[PDB]
């Protein structure tokens, strides 16, 4: 029942994300600039941690979080896209490093001037290395149809992403929806678009094996710990616990009872075989 209310996890690479979200380490908001190529064996998340700065949400975000928690950190490799005929310097007032900017890991695509046009550009990336990729893109659902026409020219917009297994299409509906993808090695993604598209710039590659927690306390470097729960660290050799059932790691299993006492000692007769508390009258204190 006694828990250390500090995350003491020395001997392991530990990063404290803080204001940075878990999904943010791929997207790259202003609050995750120092965790873009992080490598750790314990990825701690926070209550105030936000995945994005621009208003929007992911798709299969719980699955992506469960992939990222055991990822062991992500290794960014540039996909090599460069764009001719369109502007790749889109910014917003919501995300501010120094001035009005956008994500560091992905590039917002616009037109040359307002209401002009948008060329049908198609791009591709081939996985050279043997680890699976973690490609993610974005679709910009604009606030108004007039703003959509100003940003990406007049007409309907069609964005499709294809691969060996993944094959889908997206249409904006007039604010940013991020869709990820699991890309097997020696497979070519295809980013065909003619409009709103938060185009990727770097590909995330998984480093190894780790485990992620979701806490609200500080980080220490003193214990040799295996399992951490949402309000501290539980270390013991005991088999059962009572603190929290959502603990992640290698820790005692959760039971409802608060005190299960194993009789390490023997039967006390103070002042089944029938010797103790039997023909023997009472126990002895002088031994």
């Amino acid at each position, epitope marked *: 029942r006694t828990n250390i209310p500090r995350i003491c996890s020395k001997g392991k690479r530990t990063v404290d994300l803080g204001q940075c979200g878990l999904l943010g380490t791929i997207t790259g908001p202003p609050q995750c600039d120092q965790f873009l190529e992080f490598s750790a064996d314990l990825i701690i998340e926070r209550r105030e941690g936000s995945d994005v700065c621009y208003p929007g949400k992911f798709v299969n975000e719980e699955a992506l979080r469960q992939i990222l928690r055991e990822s062991g950190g992500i290794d960014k490799e540039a996909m*090599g896209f460069t764009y001719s005929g369109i502007r790749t310097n889109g910014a917003t007032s919501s995300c501010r490093r120094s001035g009005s900017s956008f994500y560091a890991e992905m590039k917002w695509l616009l037109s040359n001037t307002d209401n002009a046009a948008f060329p049908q550009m198609t*791009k591709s990336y081939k996985n050279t290395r043997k680890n699976p990729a973690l490609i993610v893109w974005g679709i910009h659902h604009s606030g108004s149809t007039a703003e959509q026409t100003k940003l990406y020219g007049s007409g309907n917009k069609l964005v499709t992403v294809g691969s060996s297994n993944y094959q889908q299409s997206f249409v904006p509906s007039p604010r940013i929806d991020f869709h990820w993808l699991m890309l097997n090695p020696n497979d070519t993604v295809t980013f065909s678009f003619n409009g709103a598209f938060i185009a990727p710039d770097r590909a995330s590659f998984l480093r190894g094996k780790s485990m992620g927690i979701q806490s609200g306390v500080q980080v220490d470097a003193d214990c040799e710990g295996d399992c951490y729960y949402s309000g501290g660290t539980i270390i013991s050799n005991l088999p059962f616990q009572n603190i929290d059932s959502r603990a992640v790691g290698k820790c005692p299993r959760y039971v409802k009872q608060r005190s299960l006492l194993l009789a390490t000692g023997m039967k006390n007769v103070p002042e089944l075989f029938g010797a103790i508390a039997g023909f023997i009258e009472n126990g002895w204190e002088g031994l």
Partner: antibody
Amino acid sequence: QVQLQESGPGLVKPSETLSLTCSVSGGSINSYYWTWIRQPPGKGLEWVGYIYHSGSTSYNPSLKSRITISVAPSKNHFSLELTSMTAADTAVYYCARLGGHGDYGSDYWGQGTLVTVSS
Amino acid sequence: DIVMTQSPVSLPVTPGEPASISCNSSQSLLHSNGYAHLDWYLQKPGQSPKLMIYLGLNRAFGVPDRFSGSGSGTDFTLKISRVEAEDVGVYYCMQALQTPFTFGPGTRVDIK
């Protein structure tokens, strides 16, 4: 834009090792394939081999075991190094990244250096 | 190795004509999606080639609307609907499907 520019010698003795350079500007070699297009005078373009930023390469089978393309430790410099230079191998060497490996509607070529095999 | 062939060798043009250059292939140049992996290059004399048509039928930036590539499978053809004086030069078609990479023999487009 990723602007490319190549430089190197122009007077090269026969059966001597050739060495060029191609320094990019506007970007750096951290992604994509980098191609070393060959052109003899009056003949067609010949691809001799691309190089990835990691180090993997795919050389030309017709010119195997003659060209050692390597990228410098600095990430804004990659070079060609050809062994056993032939008088029939006199060409106008180019330096480019080609828009067929990836981003399809964008490519950037060099300027075109002159090499000559004479005594 | 994939060999490239194209017809004709030299097609002379008058300023103002509908013109057609066709480049053939010895193997079907279709990747897993990604359209058809052949691109069109255009070389001025004493300069470097720059991309005109990528993936067979898509126009690159800086390319006027007169150029229009088309084709599928192994038959690829470049069409020009209006010939001016700045279209003179050698035409190269490149496959970008599998290693090794080869160019065409070249289409020396002269005048008259």
